[PDB]
Symmetry: C5
Subunit: 376 residues, 5 copies
């Protein structure tokens, strides 16, 4: 993930222009290889047309180049790119939205599962650990970076996400499908045992805990689905054919013909087809957007930081359920205790942001006295 939120906070002079000076996650890094190949091919065709061919071959080539430049079109390619890239971006955001965060569940576990003694600590930590374990199982199923971190279940044991007893239990249950769902069943059964043991005081709390857990299960199922059900291959191939055929046609139809022939549009032979290069930048970069985002769990600069999420979720959830269990800051009267209309101060840098309230669009409507009278 390349974050440039702070650079575009305001619409300043050339806001998006400055973003062109970026390399990581940039268009340049994404398409320099394809552009170099296109450059090599274009100048190979130019050299062959300028040296190898005879006069009659050059005339035939010039006719072909005019014919090809007659057949360059930007409406269908831009259309299909817009629709396809829009689909890819929608799925990309949905995939972020199905990343499980344990925060709601961990607040419930910290509150509901009672006991500061060793059994209570053990129970709360085990529950939140089951949630984290299910999350990491699916993430290593779908993310290359997480898989590289945890290439085997033994790695999950060595890294502490899974105890040896849990690993053995998982191996007992093994079915010929991805076993990421198992920690949710474990969570449900341990939660039931906790309620029966008196660690959960009331079944409505159990209901809440299992609701949050199953929300996490649904998010993980959506992650599995996006990993499994690719955007249909035919659609990707269609868009790819459109783009690559455009630029293969440009390989000939954008040649600078011999200036001595004085064809229309070929009066001058500038060596560099700059506008064709700009079209390459546009269209191939537009395609590279989809190429990068189609699988947002790889190792691209702008792919999600899954390993960071895994680490953060483990740290925060364990802290929440263990150290913060019934551990509150002292409750004391706040600064506005007897201030009916609190007005927190502003700094010098923020004073201009003090706004009067918007009361509604109808607030300033002017009505005459007769207009306001209720009729019988």
């Amino acid at each position: 993930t390349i974050t440039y939120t702070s650079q575009v906070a305001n619409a300043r002079l050339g806001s998006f222009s400055r973003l062109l000076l970026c390399w990581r996650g940039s268009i340049y890094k994404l398409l320099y290889g394809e552009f170099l190949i296109f450059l090599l091919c274009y100048y190979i065709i130019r050299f062959i047309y300028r040296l190898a061919l005879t006069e009659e071959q050059q005339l035939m080539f010039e006719k072909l180049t005019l014919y090809c430049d007659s057949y360059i079109q930007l409406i269908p390619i831009s259309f299909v790119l817009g629709f396809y890239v829009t689909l890819v971006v929608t799925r990309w955001w949905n995939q972020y939205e199905n990343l499980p965060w344990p925060d709601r569940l961990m607040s419930l576990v910290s509150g509901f599962v009672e006991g500061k003694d060793e059994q209570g600590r053990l129970l709360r930590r085990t529950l939140i650990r089951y949630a984290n374990l299910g999350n990491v199982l699916i993430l290593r199923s779908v993310s290359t970076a997480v898989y590289k971190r945890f290439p085997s279940a033994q790695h999950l044991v060595q890294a502490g996400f899974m105890t040896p007893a849990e690993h053995k239990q998982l191996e007992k249950l093994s079915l010929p499908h991805n076993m990421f769902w198992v920690p949710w069943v474990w969570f449900a059964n341990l939660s039931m045992k906790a309620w029966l043991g008196g660690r959960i005081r009331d079944p409505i709390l159990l209901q809440s805990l299992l609701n949050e857990m199953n929300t996490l299960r649904t998010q993980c199922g959506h992650l599995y689905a996006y990993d499994w059900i690719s955007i249909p291959l035919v659609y990707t191939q269609v868009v790819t054919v459109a783009v690559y055929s455009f630029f293969l046609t440009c390989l000939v139809g954008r040649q600078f013909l011999n200036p001595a022939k004085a064809y229309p549009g070929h009066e001058l032979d500038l060596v560099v087809p700059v506008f064709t290069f700009l079209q390459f930048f546009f269209y191939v970069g537009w395609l590279k957007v989809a190429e990068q985002l189609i699988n947002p769990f790889g190792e691209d600069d702008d792919d999600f930081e899954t390993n960071w999420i895994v680490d953060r979720n483990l740290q925060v959830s364990l802290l929440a359920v263990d150290e913060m269990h019934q551990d509150l800051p002292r409750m004391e009267p706040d600064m506005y205790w007897n201030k009916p209309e609190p007005q927190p101060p502003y700094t010098a840098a923020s004073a201009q942001f003090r706004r009067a309230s918007f009361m509604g669009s109808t607030f300033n409507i002017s009505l005459n006295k007769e207009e306001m009278e209720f009729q019988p």
Copy 2:
């Protein structure tokens, strides 16, 4: 389903170009027959124009070809294809999203329905079996592959989804509509009986169970709806007419006229209309996207793997409710038991993914000492 997620994890050099080497679920497999017919027709017209016609007939044909190539348009067809294919793809993803998964329900059944004895096993298995049975009833109503697997209710009995007693009960209840809804009523009544019998300890658990079950019912109703309410026939016919009329017009308007006449754009007769073939590939493949996805429960390469889902759901749900009922890995202190800030290690291949946390976009803002002072 053709999964190429792993091939497009990163935006590598020619990522989408390599996908052109695929055959299963490819554009080639989808449109080779239509393309061969188009090839045959185009070259039939060429042969007739080059041999059968007289000089005056050839002049008339050339005028017609110029007139037809005047009338080739790409804006309306690409427009309507974009909108229609977008609708088809939206419905396709929605149809995946309404595939029932028993996982949330099975966690609830494993936790809530008590008793390791034979009656408890029987009850839990029966409940989860009712869920699976309803799912398979709708799926065989909507999916050709599942119907081929279970062409009669007796097949569902022979395959174990339905007991003979359940089959007889279903035949007693028969109405002249699809009876896929019956297992939900059975599930509700059995759940009520379980609560009254003491197998479910508290009515809030019953409420949760029935909520998950009815979520599955709603997903099945949406599956029925997509099966029943087709994309309106007129829309499909409109898009089809646009595409096929484009290429019927190309059958004449893309002929290479006699080079001896020296018409504009016909200076050279290359035998193969390569750019017209590329347009065919684009537009007809774009249409084939909709043709494949419009009914995602058929036997296309990229249709959903419904039979696999049925098998997996049965296996996993039975395991969850029977073998995993109150069967937990031993609860023991985890590796970070007295580690306040756990840091799971990284492998060599994953070490570069260790990221510092993003603290927020405002983190690096610089403010002078005077700027930070609270004003009175």
Copy 3:
């Protein structure tokens, strides 16, 4: 509703081409009258230009025809048609999605409302009948076919949706607005009475029942809203003006001018403007999509089958709450009772659908032994 789901299960050779042989719900049926009028007008203009006009009038007409064909544009019309038809189709699917189905509620009523005696039957049937009654009240408010079936409340009494006592109660409550909301209030009050009478054992069940009922109420409110708040008239008029002005302009600008004048593009006078007819088919059929779907509760071939839904819902809900109340198939061990990994068999026709599980996109990643080592 015209269902062609089975005809498009696979992307077969000319899948969408075969759909052109349909008449019901087809483009042909939708626009043959408009096309015939357009044909009559076009050939009237041709006849007048070819017979009535003098030479100078013909020259003026030819100049006008060239001027009009200069002003034919496809970008704005296709744009506005795409956006408007997309809006219509979105609303059409939403309107299907707000059709009330009693199935979730009926499962809850069958389970929760206790008593096989006459009072229990009466209570369950009355509750589900109130749900069906509210649904039919809104549907007859919004659907022409349902209104034709039930043109007065007395028709609802004669058809059994409403008892005479209920009809009298409704007449007592009459307000000058649509009274479709009344059965929900009746349902709430009867449910409360049932809970107080001991027929509902616990208030959480009452809560669930009322939640399902109010979901139905919200769907009915959305149906009322779509019936009331039309797509704004100005938008419909804008799209209509675009399409009809295009083809009124074609009435002159697509005339085949006198071939003797040898104008550009008029070298040959083929009698039939076939490409203009294809444009008519495209654009007017595209518009007819919106015309058919804008009100999906009329009598078009592809309008929803509201009367069938009403009948089915009544039959199924009454069966569910009365005959199926605490009426379960015998609970017995299933076929996979002691089979830890059940594998339901496949038929010959379905054996090729047996798939291995997709384990995740990262499953096949190759890592060296050194790469997998955890670093310190």
Copy 4:
């Protein structure tokens, strides 16, 4: 709101053509003034060019007119209009969707809040009145028509939405922001008092009541948000500049040049630029769609009928909570009491709508006997 749902129930001959005969909420009413101004300006330019200018000035003007007609473009304007108007229409429908209806809440209040005595009536009426009061407070904040009806809080007292005691309490609580949120806090506190007083029998009913109330609060918050956060001014200005610059350019580039000069496309001087007028109708009406819908709570023909909604909600909610409280039609066996498969009759006008059930797309698949055999 202009409802034409009944006029477009079926896709009849010229369905949308007949809608062109409408005046209220029509394109004509929306843009006749702008069109008249455009007419005046165009013919002023024509008169000046035909009378005031000398020969050299006319030649310069003709060159300018050709240059301007070279620069008329329809792709960007139609693009930006499509996207912007689509955004406006999406927000317009969302704003309808956030109109609060008390119906779910009123069913809950009628059922749950017990007591036919004066205190019970008073309590139920007060609760539903608080809901209606909050709704009217936000609506008068956002709707010009409602504000004109209730220009002061004293008007709300005089109209009965607010008692004098409630008005005084509101004045005590006054903060420098819109106080529409206050009735929800009042509702919560009165509901709590009702539960403590025995008027609400069980806290789950209290939970349900407050859930419905807070749903209404969220809808009101969304109404406030749409009122406050306008579509960004720059977007509106961009679309406006595009449209108005198109037609300012048309003011010169669509002049009919002197026919004596025989310029291309100016061979005939028809006095009326009819096609430019049709473009005006299209593009300016398309813009007028956004202009009307951007604030759907004003006084346009197609703005929401907020005052009617306020009146209806008050009437229906008071009836539901007061007259209909525990007031049910007599419960008696229905007409299909001993009819296992009820078939409500059809009228003559509706008999053709009797449909056979759609059993699913797979129903008609043909399989040989060998194909159906389960393999080992």
Copy 5:
């Protein structure tokens, strides 16, 4: 936020035209600097071409200008701008939708947490303060204006959002990630303690409180996500390249060539390329829409008023939980106490808004007596 809702309530004559007279949040303010730079560059090129170059250099320049104006395209740029700006606007509205409002939670806290004594006040205020504190922590993480107001946690203490004890507790818990989640855990634990202490009477109320709190947590998580996961840099760079390359090409291809050469389209040298300036206004303003909205939490005129929201939420929530706790207006019979059909009056200005109810689209259907008869 620039609110112009009241200015566009009705579709009046030149409604959007009047909006062009705005400066704050206007297109002019957003792009005057870029436009001035473009003006300087264009006229520099004009001056160089008119003075510095020789005759042969001028001929070469004229050929280049014709070549560049051949390569100006509006379809791809408008396409990509439409899609990208649509994405930005969707995310902008979503980001408003994830702004936490405490109103639902504060109603629950005011109702459920009992006790008018000092401990009850302290408890209610502490809970609502925890909600506000979490909200301000995330907002200062994501909003530049809020960060400028609260550049350190000590500022939050000095401003009263955080007590010193809370600040110390936060410093004890510090992890190397954003600690905005901590107040939710505190809220859960304090709520649990309140329930155990008898301040919350029943666990269903606790469940409701924690549900509302966790809704706020999810909204804050979405705010963090939008702050962290920028729209991918490559997409922004692609759109920027398209726009800026268009206008860099215009710098040469829109030059007015020497009128003495009499090139096509260059017959007259008007000094100002007005239409190119209008294209600049359109396209660059369209881009500026995204530039302003891409980060809606900066200091742009149309960015959200986050500081106002913070202040309002604190004031209203403290009032709701402290002063309004069990503080109700006197309950008395309302004005329509014995009025079965209440009709609140209308003012003179609003009388024309009195509407008859829309009864449904089918209301006016005419049926003959024979048509209405039920057939056997």
